[PDB]
Amino acid sequence: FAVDAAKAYKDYLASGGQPITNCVKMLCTHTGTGQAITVTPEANMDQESFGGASCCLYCRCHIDHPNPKGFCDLKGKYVQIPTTCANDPVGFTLKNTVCTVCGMWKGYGCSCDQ
Amino acid sequence: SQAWQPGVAMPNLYKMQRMLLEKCDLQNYGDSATLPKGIMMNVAKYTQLCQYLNTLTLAVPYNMRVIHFGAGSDKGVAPGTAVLRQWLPTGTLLVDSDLNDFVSDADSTLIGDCATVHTANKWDLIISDMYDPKTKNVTKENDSKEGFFTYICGFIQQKLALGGSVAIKITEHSWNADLYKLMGHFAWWTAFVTNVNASSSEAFLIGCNYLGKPREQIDGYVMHANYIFWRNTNPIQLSSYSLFDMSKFPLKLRGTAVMSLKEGQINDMILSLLSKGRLIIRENNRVVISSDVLVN
Ligand SMILES: Nc1ncnc2c1ncn2[C@@H]1O[C@H](CSCC[C@H](N)C(=O)O)[C@@H](O)[C@H]1O
Numbered sequence: 289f290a291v292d293a294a295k296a297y298k299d300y301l302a303s304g305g306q307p308i309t310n311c312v313k314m315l316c317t318h319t320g321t322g323q324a325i326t327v328t329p330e331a332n333m334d335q336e337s338f339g340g341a342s343c344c345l346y347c348r349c350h351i352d353h354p355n356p357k358g359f360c361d362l363k364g365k366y367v368q369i370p371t372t373c374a375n376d377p378v379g380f381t382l383k384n385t386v387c388t389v390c391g392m393w394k395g396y397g398c399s400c401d402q
Numbered sequence: 403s404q405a406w407q408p409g410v411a412m413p414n415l416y417k418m419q420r421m422l423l424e425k426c427d428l429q430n431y432g433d434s435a436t437l438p439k440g441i442m443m444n445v446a447k448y449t450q451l452c453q454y455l456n457t458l459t460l461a462v463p464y465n466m467r468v469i470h471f472g473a474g475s476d477k478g479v480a481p482g483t484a485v486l487r488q489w490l491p492t493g494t495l496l497v498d499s500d501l502n503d504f505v506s507d508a509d510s511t512l513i514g515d516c517a518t519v520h521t522a523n524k525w526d527l528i529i530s531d532m533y534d535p536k537t538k539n540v541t542k543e544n545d546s547k548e549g550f551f552t553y554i555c556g557f558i559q560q561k562l563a564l565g566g567s568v569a570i571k572i573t574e575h576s577w578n579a580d581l582y583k584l585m586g587h588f589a590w591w592t593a594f595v596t597n598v599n600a601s602s603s604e605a606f607l608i609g610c611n612y613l614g615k616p617r618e619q620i621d622g623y624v625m626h627a628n629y630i631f632w633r634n635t636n637p638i639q640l641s642s643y644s645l646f647d648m649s650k651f652p653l654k655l656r657g658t659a660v661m662s663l664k665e666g667q668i669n670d671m672i673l674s675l676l677s678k679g680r681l682i683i684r685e686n687n688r689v690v691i692s693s694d695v696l697v698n
Pocket residue numbers: 444471472473474475476480481482483499500501502514515516517531532533534549550
């Protein structure tokens with residue numbers, strides 16, 4: 289047994305639940321690289337930058353991160369969210385994947401498949 | 403006009419007065435600044451504080467050490483810590499702390515009363531946003547407050563590196579006479595009001611470049627009265643203008659020299675370097691922190 293918070297959150301959103309709030313949006317130039325997870329805010333014109341810990345489902349729910357080491361890849365970093373998705377940064381980071389080659393979100397900036 | 407600045411610092415002539423303490427009655431009491439869409443008050447407030455700190459002679463060594471007290475919020479997150487982490491050079495060691503649990507971007511977080519926090523090492527910058535809303539009691543005399551202010555005064559004197567700086571949040575009722583006196587132990591000091599929160603009696607008491615001894619004698623009861631007098635007679639127009647230009651925000655990594663010195667070797671030439679933001683005096687060992695836990 290283990291609690292599936294990731295699945296529980298996705299299921300709650302499909303039910304019409306209000307997304308997790310108070311993710312920390314930063315002031316920035318919006319002229320950054322647009323990479324997904326960075327040491328400093330890197331939003332481009334199509335993105336918002338957020339403090340990473342505040343958009344991590346596991347940090348925010350006070351539950352273990354699901355990898356044997358319990359490391360968090362968001363805490364202490366900044367996450368770039370497409371502005372059209374910025375009402376639910378937790379859900380967005382949960383549901384999406386970063387390209388290991390260029391560092392953009394798959395389907396939101398990664399063009400490695402062209 | 404001051405509306406394009408990140409905030410307003412207490413003018414020198416107000417510091418030199420000898421006022422009696424009055425009630426703070428702010429003209430712009432009911433105004434609120436227009437924040438950029440979706441930006442939290444405290445992200446805006448810390449951004450303007452850091453923008454102002456960019457204009458001072460802060461020492462910025464490699465492997466800078468910063469501690470942030472009062473970093474939690476009723477939202478369970480740490481907006482100010484996220485701004486500090488943005489502002490500070492990459493690799494800066496940032497520790498934060500609060501009475502109540504919260505989720506943080508800091509390298510390490512301690513939960514508990516600040517009086518329980520101990521650190522082996524000295525720090526290059528101390529930020530405090532600690533505040534107890536209970537202090538706002540307009541029906542009793544507005545006296546110097548102890549509580550966490552006592553802790554902060556001792557922490558500065560024992561754990562701030564020479565050459566280091568502080569920014570400590572105060573308000574009309576949340577203040578301490580010894581903290582003002584301690585500002586005379588820095589090369590320079592001010593009380594800074596952010597433009598986004600200028601309708602509040604809040605300020606940050608900023609001490610720039612710690613010298614470890616009084617360079618000027620400050621009576622803290624008088625200087626708080628001077629601060630209130632300034633606020634009472636100088637309405638500050640609410641403004642978020644400086645939040646829209648973020649191009650020069652990051653703190654410049656100056657690579658400030660760090661040396662260990664005995665007290666005997668702090669000569670006038672060393673004092674001069676400290677006063678210019680050109681030297682930090684502390685050890686460079688490992689950073690070790692702890693929180694005391696009371697067992698039943
Ligand atoms: N004695 C004490 N020790 C530690 N924290 C204290 C304290 N007294 C008050 N505080 C904390 O000071 C905080 C003030 S609100 C701070 C907001 C925060 N800086 C932000 O970025 O949004 C509260 O969270 C409160 O818990």
